[PDB]
Design a protein around this ligand. Structure first.
Ligand SMILES: *[C@@H]1O[C@H](CO)[C@@H](O[C@@H]2O[C@H](CO)[C@@H](O[C@@H]3O[C@H](CO)[C@@H](O)[C@H](O)[C@H]3NC(C)=O)[C@H](O)[C@H]2NC(C)=O)[C@H](O)[C@H]1NC(C)=O
Ligand SMILES: *[C@@H]1O[C@H](CO)[C@@H](O[C@@H]2O[C@H](CO)[C@@H](O[C@@H]3O[C@H](CO)[C@@H](O)[C@H](O)[C@@H]3O)[C@H](O)[C@H]2NC(C)=O)[C@H](O)[C@H]1NC(C)=O
Ligand SMILES: *[C@@H]1O[C@H](CO)[C@@H](O[C@@H]2O[C@H](CO)[C@@H](O[C@@H]3O[C@H](CO)[C@@H](O)[C@H](O)[C@@H]3O)[C@H](O)[C@H]2NC(C)=O)[C@H](O)[C@H]1NC(C)=O
Ligand SMILES: *[C@@H]1O[C@H](CO)[C@@H](O[C@@H]2O[C@H](CO)[C@@H](O)[C@H](O)[C@H]2NC(C)=O)[C@H](O)[C@H]1NC(C)=O
Ligand SMILES: *[C@@H]1O[C@H](CO)[C@@H](O[C@@H]2O[C@H](CO)[C@@H](O)[C@H](O)[C@H]2NC(C)=O)[C@H](O)[C@H]1NC(C)=O
Ligand SMILES: *[C@@H]1O[C@H](CO)[C@@H](O[C@@H]2O[C@H](CO)[C@@H](O)[C@H](O)[C@H]2NC(C)=O)[C@H](O)[C@H]1NC(C)=O
Ligand SMILES: CC(=O)N[C@@H]1[C@@H](O)[C@H](O)[C@@H](CO)O[C@H]1O
Ligand SMILES: *[C@@H]1O[C@H](CO)[C@@H](O)[C@H](O)[C@H]1NC(C)=O
Ligand SMILES: *[C@@H]1O[C@H](CO)[C@@H](O)[C@H](O)[C@H]1NC(C)=O
Ligand SMILES: *[C@@H]1O[C@H](CO)[C@@H](O)[C@H](O)[C@H]1NC(C)=O
Ligand SMILES: *[C@@H]1O[C@H](CO)[C@@H](O)[C@H](O)[C@H]1NC(C)=O
Ligand SMILES: *[C@@H]1O[C@H](CO)[C@@H](O)[C@H](O)[C@H]1NC(C)=O
Ligand SMILES: *[C@@H]1O[C@H](CO)[C@@H](O)[C@H](O)[C@H]1NC(C)=O
Ligand SMILES: [Ca+2]
Ligand SMILES: [Ca+2]
Lengths: 48, 973
């Protein structure tokens, strides 16, 4: 939440559901990275 | 250097030789004599500038009243039929039979949509419709993204069918009606007669984006003029997709405003400010809307939200009253995402009376609270909308007009007044038209007052199209001078009718495209704006024309005679001539009609031919068999009769005219006898001149071709070998040299074009023309224009035989009023004849315009073809410059210096001609060159639009409008 909070303000129409905008969504994203499923997309979103 | 006496003698010899050449070759006095020799085959009739305008205004008023009668019929019948609709739900039993436009014409389509039955029309071709139309039934247009077969849609197609009988009755009462259309509030459009839609759905790679709710006539008839203020949230939280959607939505909302509406866009993030250089409400015409769109597509999101500051700013801007305003519908449109403060104190402080509507928009997908903005919406008599994606923008940014029409509905029969839109381009490719609108109310249980809930909205708008060609048929111009014309104006300054109004759309700014972001298969939109051209932008602006326009805007009738600067038909010259303006108001409507007549045009020639054999001889005269004997003849494609039609092909049109006059008698039971008689008389006179005078001297040394152009539409070029070199319009009323010769009182030299394919430099020759002046009973008449084409080489020999061929010491040139080169002295400029002098000698040209021997001034052309730059063809503004003589002084002398040089010049003006003689030292004496003086259409973007809004042109908005009714419910959001 501190790092990528509200920084997903991408102008494009593409939707990124795994973000860190509030606490429940940050928990879900961290858990998803933990299970390892599709964590590279989260990393790419954070990089961009 | 040669002195003044020598040069006076030289130029006097040249002017005498040229004047004698033109006078004794063209034969002006011969034509004058034969015009004055008869005085019995025609009569001289006055052109009363007062009676003509009254007659034309009455005809226009009667046509518009006729058109409005067919509107009230449609409105009443639609209301009555809809009041008794049943609203069923199961349509699979009794299908709905209708003809859906933009569907394929194949009988094997096998649509078989549940609940609808199709129709296959016959589609005969038609006139007054340059399409194929069917008069049996009416076509239905449903937008692409709106599903046909819905319960809402199928119910509209069920009760609206009853309009076909009224459509057919309207046509049979007046067979000249154009499209009659009902625009439904559900997106439907039922128009008559049936005709296939211009852009079908997906048979080609293209699609159509046509919603009747966004058309200018529907928007005009659906509500009253607005005072809109768009308040955009640019706080930090709108960063991302919601900012982009906000920008697109603001542009789309601006697309729904007209010239009676006043708009301004403001933004706020902890501080409220305007987005552009306007700072108050502006007229919301094409230019101001373009500026607002450009400013809106530049906002960034940064800061903290503060609704109180933004609403205070918006209300203060709505309370200005220092500027021009619609003064009817004060509304605020808030574009945000969500918040937590509803700002009750601001609304209590500023509109406790609820004189301002607040429409709120929630843009994007977000988790912010939307309750506060819904409360803001339906506390202040407004509405609340959600725009989550791009597909929602078009439908959500136009539905605010349902709310604004509630007072108009509650007014009742007071609001059923016919309004006429601005000039625009028909969606079915018919030309420039205007539409008359009338709203249709929903009256269900009107006599019992049961619901009255959805009765607060309109059913739709009825429209009837009138083409500008229909109006122009009521203002005939062939008894007038080529310089005379009609023009009609709005109570907005815009021209309904003008010679300079063209079917092209009005251009704005400079067209910039990015070819690298352009997919090949996407079908981008083209244009939807109306053709609004101000009166001052269609002619040369003058301090008296502004007074005349202001006087005829506010319904006043008067007359005025004054001196004015007249731009030529081709934008290369400017002439000074007396003109008389006579104007009167059209009673039924808000238009004002004026007739511009020069002097020498108050009387015209009316043929009095009554001998059939003479008519036959004059008719056979203009036969192609003896073009060798009587000279090649051209005929103006005028509407002599309704059977033969112009066909942009003069040989076959002349053949059709000949067989038409020879086959059936010239008694003309249904044709125009006056035009035909005038044409025959002029043909006979021109032939008499050709046979008696031009034929005697078949070959003349310096003369290449001899031409005569007369009123009526007869043009004769004596050498048939010179016929194919004649590039002038067969219509004599569109020939620039004709009008220039009419204005001037001497011989006029027209410089040939440059960089144009075809024989125009040496194989055609220089054109000199003069206007024939005759006196029948002491009355001015200028019926014909005669002139010759002079050899370039013979003129060169006349010139050289100081000023010597290819002289390296002295340059001697001849220019016309306009700075175009006509005769050089070194055979390098001579090859580039017809150029502006500033293209070859910019320093001397600039000094000449500075010593005040040449006067110039600039104007803007708002309907031009432009090539997009990098920052096919598009439309923009081009700046035009024309040069002309200023004083009557003949001889000017001086020295011009460019970088410690000294070139002595002495210009002299040729008497009784629009020419000028210049001598100067060679350009090799001083190699100086600053920059060329371009005289050409230059792509432009001016004027600066947010300096015109400080002192805008006089305007008179509508005086009757409906808002703030007590009975309105306003419990919806
Ligand atoms: C510039 O070119 C002109 C034509 O290209 C020349 O004009 C010709 O000049 C002739 C000499 O004056 C004229 O002859 C005269 O014609 C009139 C009627 O046409 C007669 O009454 C005169 O008697 C006759 N002159 C004599 C001595 O008999 C030509 O008519 C005239 N051409 C035309 C078409 O009118 C100029 O001569 C030439 N400039 C110079 C300086 O030579
Ligand atoms: C909208 O569609 C409906 C259904 O297609 C139309 O209603 C139909 O109207 C016709 C003629 O008005 C009715 O025919 C009549 O039938 C009675 C017998 O019941 C007969 O006595 C009459 O002489 C006539 O033939 C038809 O019954 C009726 N359909 C239903 C289901 O009631 C309606 O007219 C359409 N709307 C408009 C504006 O046309
Ligand atoms: C013009 O106004 C009238 C009344 O204000 C509208 O008539 C009403 O139309 C609605 C549909 O929007 C009808 O509601 C429907 O009722 C049926 C049952 O009859 C129900 O099954 C549907 O789900 C829906 O609720 C309503 O009954 C009807 N009222 C009357 C008195 O006819 C009419 O639609 C308006 N015209 C247009 C073009 O919108
Ligand atoms: C426009 O509105 C402003 C509102 O401030 C007017 O300006 C005031 O006018 C009164 C009139 O006597 C003066 O006493 C004030 O000093 C003015 N205030 C300012 C800040 O100038 C103004 O008169 C209105 N009209 C125009 C044409 O500006
Ligand atoms: C319709 O237009 C005509 C213009 O011809 C008006 O007729 C003139 O109106 C003025 C102003 O009232 C009078 O001074 C003239 O005497 C009228 N002329 C004639 C020949 O009667 C007429 O008034 C207009 N209609 C209405 C209702 O105003
Ligand atoms: C069109 O050209 C005329 C030239 O006559 C311009 O009018 C002159 O403008 C200057 C500059 O103000 C004045 O000093 C002259 O007195 C004006 N001439 C007359 C006869 O009044 C006019 O401004 C030009 N129009 C445009 C739009 O540029
Ligand atoms: C942030 C910024 O500089 N914005 C401006 C904008 O206001 C202006 O309208 C545009 C010109 O088209 O240039 C850019
Ligand atoms: C207007 O309608 C009337 C009545 O039919 C008719 O006499 C008149 O010619 C019409 N006017 C025009 C301009 O069509
Ligand atoms: C225009 O009118 C004035 C005054 O009536 C007159 O002096 C002038 O000669 C006229 N212009 C022309 C070209 O005749
Ligand atoms: C235009 O005219 C110029 C002469 O100044 C010539 O050099 C050039 O080739 C011409 N171009 C075209 C397209 O005619
Ligand atoms: C050119 O015009 C300007 C404008 O008044 C003037 O000041 C200047 O002196 C002129 N140039 C010359 C060489 O006279
Ligand atoms: C013509 O120009 C001269 C300056 O070269 C000027 O003095 C004169 O007044 C002008 N003639 C007019 C205005 O009639
Ligand atoms: C004009 O003056 C400049 C600087 O004094 C000089 O360089 C130039 O050569 C002069 N012009 C000519 C034609 O000599
Ligand atoms: Ca995986
Ligand atoms: Ca915010």
């Amino acid at each position: 939440m501190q790092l990528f909070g509200g920084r997903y303000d991408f102008e494009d129409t593409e939707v990124r559901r795994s973000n860190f905008d509030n606490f429940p969504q940050a928990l879900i994203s961290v858990f998803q990275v933990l299970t390892g499923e599709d964590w590279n997309s989260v990393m790419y979103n954070g990089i961009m | 250097f040669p002195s003044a006496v020598t040069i006076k003698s030289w130029v006097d010899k040249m002017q005498e030789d040229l004047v004698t050449l033109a006078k004794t070759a063209s034969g002006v006095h011969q034509l004058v004599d034969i015009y004055e020799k008869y005085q019995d085959l025609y009569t001289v009739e006055p052109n009363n500038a007062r009676q003509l305008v009254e007659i034309a205004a009455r005809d226009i008023e009667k046509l518009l009243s006729n058109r409005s009668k067919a509107l009230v019929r449609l409105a009443l019948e639609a209301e009555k039929v809809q009041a008794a609709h049943q609203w069923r739900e199961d349509f699979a039993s009794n299908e709905v039979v209708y003809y859906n436009a933009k569907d394929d014409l194949d009988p094997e389509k096998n649509d078989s949509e549940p609940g609808s039955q199709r129709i296959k029309p016959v589609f005969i071709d038609d006139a007054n419709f340059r399409r194929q139309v069917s008069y049996q039934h009416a076509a239905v247009h449903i937008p692409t993204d709106i599903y046909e077969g819905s319960t809402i849609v199928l119910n509209e197609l069920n009760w609206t069918s009853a309009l076909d009988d009224v459509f057919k009755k309207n046509r049979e009462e007046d067979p000249s009606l154009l499209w009659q259309v009902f625009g439904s509030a559900t997106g439907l459009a039922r128009y008559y007669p049936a005709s296939p839609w211009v852009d079908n759905s997906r048979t080609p790679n293209k699609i159509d984006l046509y919603d009747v709710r966004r058309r200018p006539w529907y928007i005009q008839g659906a509500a009253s003029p607005k005072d809109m203020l768009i308040l955009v949230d640019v706080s930090g939280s709108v960063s991302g997709l919601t900012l982009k959607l906000i920008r697109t939505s603001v542009s789309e909302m601006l697309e729904t405003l007209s010239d009676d509406d006043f708009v301004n866009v403001a933004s706020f993030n902890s501080n409220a400010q305007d987005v552009s250089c306007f700072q108050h409400l502006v007229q919301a015409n094409v230019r101001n809307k373009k500026v607002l769109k450009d400013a809106v597509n530049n906002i960034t999101a940064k800061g903290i939200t503060d609704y109180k500051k933004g609403f205070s700013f918006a209300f203060e801007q709505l309370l200005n009253y220092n500027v021009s305003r619609a003064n009817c519908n004060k509304i605020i449109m808030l574009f945000t995402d969500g918040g937590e403060e509803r700002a009750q104190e601001i609304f209590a402080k500023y509109n406790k009376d609820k004189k301002v509507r607040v429409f709120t928009f929630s843009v994007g997908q977000h988790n912010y609270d939307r309750g506060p903005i819904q409360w803001m919406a339906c506390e202040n008599k407004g509405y609340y909308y959600e725009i989550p994606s791009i597909g929602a923008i078009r439908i959500n940014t136009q539905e605010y007009l349902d709310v604004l029409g509630r007072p108009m509905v509650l007014a009742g029969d007071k609001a059923k007044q016919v309004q006429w839109t601005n000039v625009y381009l028909d969606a079915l490719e018919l030309g420039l038209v205007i539409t008359g609108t009338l709203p249709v109310f929903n009256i269900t249980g009107q006599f019992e007052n049961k619901t009255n809930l959805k009765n607060q909205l309109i059913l739709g708008v009825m429209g009837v199209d009138v083409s500008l060609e229909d109006i122009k048929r009521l203002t005939p111009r062939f008894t007038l001078c080529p310089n005379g014309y009609y023009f009609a104006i709005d109570p907005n300054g815009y021209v309904l009718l003008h010679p300079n109004l063209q079917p092209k759309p009005i251009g704005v700014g400079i067209p910039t495209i990015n070819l690298r972001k352009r997919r090949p298969n996407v079908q981008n939109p083209k244009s939807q704006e109306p053709v609004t051209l101000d009166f001052l932008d269609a002619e040369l602006e003058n301090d008296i024309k502004v007074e005349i326009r202001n006087k005829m805007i506010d319904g006043e009738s008067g007359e005025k005679t004054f001196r004015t600067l007249v731009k030529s038909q081709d934008e290369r010259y400017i002439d000074k001539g007396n003109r008389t303006y006579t104007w009167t108001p059209v009673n039924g409507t808000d238009y004002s009609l004026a007739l511009v007549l020069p002097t020498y045009s108050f009387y015209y020639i009316k043929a009095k031919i009554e001998e059939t054999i003479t008519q036959a001889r004059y008719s056979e005269t203009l036969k192609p068999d003896n073009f060798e004997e009587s000279g090649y003849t051209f005929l103006a494609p005028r509407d002599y009769c309704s059977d033969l039609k112009p066909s942009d092909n003069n040989t076959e049109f002349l053949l059709n005219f000949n067989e038409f006059i020879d086959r059936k008698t010239p008694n003309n039971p249904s044709c125009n006898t006056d035009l035909i008689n005038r044409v025959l008389l002029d043909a006979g006179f021109t032939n008499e001149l050709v046979q008696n005078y031009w034929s005697k001297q078949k070959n003349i040394k310096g003369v290449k071709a001899r031409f005569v152009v007369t009123d009526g539409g007869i043009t004769r070029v004596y050498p048939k070998e010179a016929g194919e070199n004649w590039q002038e319009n067969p219509e004599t009323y569109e020939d620039s040299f004709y009008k220039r010769s009419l204005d001037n009182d001497n011989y006029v030299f027209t410089a040939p074009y440059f960089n144009k394919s075809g024989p125009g430099a040496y194989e055609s020759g220089i054109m000199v023309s003069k206007a024939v002046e005759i006196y029948i009973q002491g009355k001015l008449l200028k019926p014909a224009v005669v002139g010759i084409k002079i050899d370039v080489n013979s003129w060169i020999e006349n010139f050289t035989k100081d000023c010597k061929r290819n002289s390296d010491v002295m340059d001697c040139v001849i220019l016309d009023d306009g700075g175009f080169l006509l005769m050089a002295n070194h055979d390098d400029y001579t090859n580039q004849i017809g150029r502006f002098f500033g293209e070859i000698d910019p320093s001397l040209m600039r000094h000449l315009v500075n010593i005040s021997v040449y006067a110039f001034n600039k104007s803007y052309d708002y309907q031009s073809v432009c090539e997009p730059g990098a920052a096919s063809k598009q439309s923009c503004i081009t700046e035009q410059t024309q040069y002309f003589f200023d004083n009557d002084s003949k001889s000017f002398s001086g020295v011009l210096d460019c970088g410690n040089c000294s070139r002595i010049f002495h210009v002299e003006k040729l008497m009784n001609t629009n020419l000028i003689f210049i001598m100067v030292e060679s350009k090799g004496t001083c190699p100086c060159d600053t920059r060329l003086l371009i005289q050409a259409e230059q792509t432009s973007d001016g004027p600066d639009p947010c300096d015109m809004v400080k002192q805008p042109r006089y305007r008179k908005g509508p005086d009757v409008c409906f808002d703030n009714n007590v009975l309105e419910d306003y419990t919806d959001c």
